[PDB]
Structures are given as C-alpha cells and as structure tokens.
C-alpha cells in the first residue's frame, strides 16, 4: 500500500520482509529483472520454493492446495508468484485472494505481479486487508529524454565504457525497448572485452528494433523535417500499428490546432493552451509547433488527411498505411499548395 519505487523496494527487501509484495507498472524488462532480484534475495533468505500461478478469470485457484497444506519433505518456506491479467482481476478473484490470505501460513509469501489496477480493483477486499502489512511498488520505463542518463548509468554499473555518439545511436535505434538495449549492451561487452567502445562497431551490433507509439509522430511533422519523418515512418515498419490509431491521433491534434488558429485572434495562445492541457510535456511544444504554419497550410493538411480518411475506410485501400508516408512527407516543404489537389 506504500506505493513506492523499486529503488526503495530494494531497501525494504534488504530489511525484514514486509509480508506480501506487489510490484506493478507496465515494464518492458524492469518487471522481470526486479522479479529476478526478488528471487535471488529470497533464495538467500528462507523462502526458496517459487510456485508460479497465473491469476486469470475462469481459472480456478489451485493455490489453495499450497495454502491449506504445508510442505512436508523440504518446507524451506515458499513463495507464490502471481501473474495478474493485463486488465486486472475481478471481484471473485479479489475475494478469493482474501480467502487465501486467511489460509496463509507463516512460511508462505505472497507475490502479486501485474500492471496498474483500477481503483475498485486497487481498493478490493484483499488489498484493503493487506494494507496493514503488505507493500505496493510501481515503476515505468524511462522516456525519450530520460534514456541517455539511464543507459550511461547501466553501462557504469556493468563496468563498460560508452561514448556520446554510442549513446546517441543507441537512443535512436533502441528508444524505450530496454530488453533490446540490455541485449545490445551485453553483445557489445562480449564482442569486445576491451572496455572501450566509442563508435567502432556499435552500429554493427545494433539493429533498428524499438517501439514507437503514435504521439511522437506529429512531434516530427510539426517541424516538417522530411528526412526525420521519413526515417520515423521507416522505423515504424515491422511493428506496424494499424493506420486507424495514427489517423485518430493526427486528426485529434490537427482539429485542436485548427481550433487554436481560429482562436489565435482571441485570448493568447498560452491562455488558450490553458484550455488545451494535452500535456505535450509543456503545452509549449505545441506552442513552438504553431509558430510554423498558415491558414492555407492547415487547409492543405486537412484536405489530404480527410481524403485519406475516406481512402482507407470507404473502399478499403491497401496502400493507405504507406499513405501515412505520403501525407506526412508532403507537408514538410509545402508552405501552401496552389490548389491543384484541394482534396
């Protein structure tokens, strides 16, 4: 219930165990390595038998068998590692968890692992009853701007030297995909145990395998950088989200931006953003975005976008995903189109 960060969960792990542990937060790899650290700490301590249970609706609780009966040949305590569903559990499972805690033995440990829960799921009967002694901890992957420091810190922990150019190429190639980042770090360490990597082969042992959620796409398109936007779209290949999500995203911000430009003659852009708290990390990134445009520019953007909107859904076009390449690139160096398209 404490709702702390794993940098402190390590501290509570070093001290006396605070009964059941619940580590949450959507994690690429940090959840698994935190689980591994918990496993090794427990193995050093009493609890050694890690029984893996997948918490899911429509799946009966075989954990009661461990809960009601104690181990007989090697007790050695034991730990129940629970895997939560990606949407959270239901009331039946939440109350059966409380029943299990009622069946808890002194050598039993409860570990609940999952993603962020809903408020009712968070404040269920089991969590409420365990709020007296259990702990809660959450973590999330670093952002784009927070990546270089994290990568450098991990490199310094692993006793391998990095460089600014190497960090740049890593944060470009592996942006938010820490599993790939960790594998690349291990590969660069094992390839050359010299301990000096500046830019000799870091690209040779690093591919383009990273996640890219749509919110950053306009962040490039608002500068109108042709090569950068084209490279971002090429990076989006092989993890290709269906076009509808990207289309919804850019229609959202373009409707917001056209409303902003309509109201620009009225109350200034900052106090207008006061209504448009879309948390674009300052609401000022949109402020520098709106600096480079024109009303005719917005017309040329919206015509192509709305033509695509019927180009993929009215007749089910197959090039429409590649059309996202077409629409984003043409806006980069189009101050205003002299009609000739006006879709």
């Amino acid at each position: 219930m404490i709702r702390l960060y794993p940098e402190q969960l390590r501290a509570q792990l070093n001290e006396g165990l605070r009964a059941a542990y619940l580590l949450l937060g959507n994690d690429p790899l940090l959840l698994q390595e935190s689980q591994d650290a918990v496993r090794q700490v427990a193995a050093a301590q009493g609890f050694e038998e890690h029984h893996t249970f997948s918490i899911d609706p429509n799946t009966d609780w075989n954990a009661i068998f461990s809960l009601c009966q104690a181990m007989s040949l090697f007790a050695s305590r034991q730990t129940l590692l629970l895997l939560l569903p990606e949407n959270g559990p239901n009331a039946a499972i939440n109350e059966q968890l409380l029943t299990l805690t009622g069946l808890l033995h002194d050598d039993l440990l409860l570990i609940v692992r999952g993603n962020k829960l809903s408020k009712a799921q968070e404040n269920a009967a089991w969590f409420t009853a365990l709020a007296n002694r259990s702990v809660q901890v959450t973590c999330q992957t670093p952002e784009q701007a927070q990546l270089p420091r994290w990568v450098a810190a991990r490199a310094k922990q692993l006793n391998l030297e990095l460089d600014d150019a190497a960090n740049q190429v890593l944060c470009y190639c592996y942006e938010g995909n820490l599993l790939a980042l960790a594998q690349a770090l291990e590969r660069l360490s094992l390839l050359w145990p010299d301990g000096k990597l500046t830019l000799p082969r870091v690209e040779q042992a690093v591919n383009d395998a990273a996640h890219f959620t749509p919110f950053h796409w306009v962040d490039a398109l608002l500068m109108g950088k042709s090569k950068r936007a084209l490279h971002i779209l090429q990076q989006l290949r092989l993890e290709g989200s269906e076009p509808v999500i990207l289309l919804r995203t850019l229609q959202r911000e373009l409707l917001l931006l056209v409303n902003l430009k309509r109201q620009s003659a009225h109350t200034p852009l900052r106090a207008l953003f006061d209504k448009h708290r879309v948390w674009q990390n300052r609401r000022g990134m949109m402020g520098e975005a709106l600096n480079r445009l024109s009303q005719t520019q917005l017309r040329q953007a919206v015509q192509l976008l709305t033509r695509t909107e019927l180009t993929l859904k009215q007749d089910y076009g197959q090039s429409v995903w590649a059309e996202l390449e077409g629409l984003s690139l043409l806006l980069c160096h189009k101050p205003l189109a002299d009609v000739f398209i006006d879709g």
Binding site: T52, Q69, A70, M71, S72, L73
Partner: protein
C-alpha cells in the same frame, strides 16, 4: 536385400505385440519411432518398440522354419492385421524388396516398411545392481507406494519413484511432497 520369414500363430503373437505396442501410441518425432522393429535372429523373434525413453522387446520362439533379417513395420497396422484374423490361423510373413507381405491362407496384405538401420537402439552399459526379485514382491513394492507419485511437479524429479537398496533389502521412495511412502521387502 534382407528377406525374413515368419511362420507364427495368433495366440503366441497377440500378447507380445500388445506389450510392445501399448506405449507406442501418438505421433513420435522420428517416423521410425512410430514404427515397430521386427528382428528374426536364429529361432527367435525380437519385437522392439521405443519412445526415446523406454524400449519394450518381446521374444517369440520360432518352431516353424524362418529366415533371419531385420525390418520395421507400422505398429498400428501390423497389430490390426494380426488382430481380427481367425483364431488359430497361421501368419506367414515374407519381406520382399520394399514391402512386407503377410498371409493367412485366404488373406494377403502388403505393408510398407522402413529400413532397419534407421531404428535407434539404447547403448549397452554396466548394470551395477542386478538381482532376481520375486515377481509378487516387486508387485507389492510398486502397488503399496505407487498411489503417491506427485506427477507433473515443478521439481522435475519428484515425478519418479526412487529405489534404494541395502544388503538383502530394498525400498521404494514415493517422492510426493506432502506425501511420503516407503516399503521394506
């Protein structure tokens, strides 16, 4: 090349086929593992069936004339051929070229085989503890402590019996977890 000659009866062939082809159900990784190895050596038939884990070998006396050789036959098809034939009928077998022909007087079948060289065998080893236990005693040992096994357990060794020996006595440990069992015969 090889050409073996079977001359056998159903009653002395049904049970060995059952004992050698019982565990051979399902689809195995090598297709030869789904096959049953027939060997005709001296006046002896050796029927071999494997699952990469256990081998059943049945020996059948060949009182009637025979020819030595080695081949492999689809176990289910051969068993269903031997089964259902009239009681007391004689099965004769000749493996010609590629196919093996079975005959019961008024019936003839031609089954496809696989070369005997492809069939895997378990290498010889040294048997440390060799004994001739009474069959009933071993049956008691198994049954009195087999109800507790803990099949499908994470330990990946709790799933099997343990056998311990000392002097003229032995025990069978039923590694189960919350259950233990032992038997001293």
């Amino acid at each position: 090349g090889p050409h073996m000659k079977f001359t056998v009866e159903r009653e002395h062939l049904l049970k060995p086929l059952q004992q050698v082809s019982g565990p051979l159900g399902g689809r195995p990784t090598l297709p030869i593992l789904g096959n049953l190895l027939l060997q005709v050596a001296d006046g002896t038939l050796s029927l071999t069936g494997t699952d990469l884990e256990m081998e059943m070998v049945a020996r059948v006396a060949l009182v009637q004339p025979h020819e030595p050789g080695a081949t492999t036959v689809p176990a289910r098809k051969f068993f269903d051929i031997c089964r259902g034939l009239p009681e007391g009928a004689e099965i004769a077998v000749q493996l010609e070229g590629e196919r093996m022909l079975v005959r019961s007087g008024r019936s003839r079948f031609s089954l496809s085989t696989l070369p005997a060289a492809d069939f895997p065998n378990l290498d010889d080893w040294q048997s440390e503890v060799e004994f001739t236990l009474p069959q009933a005693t071993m049956k008691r040992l198994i049954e009195a402590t087999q109800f507790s096994m803990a099949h499908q357990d994470v330990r990946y060794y709790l799933n099997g019996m343990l056998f311990e020996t000392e002097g003229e006595e032995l025990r069978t440990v039923a590694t189960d977890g919350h259950r233990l069992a032992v038997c001293s015969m």
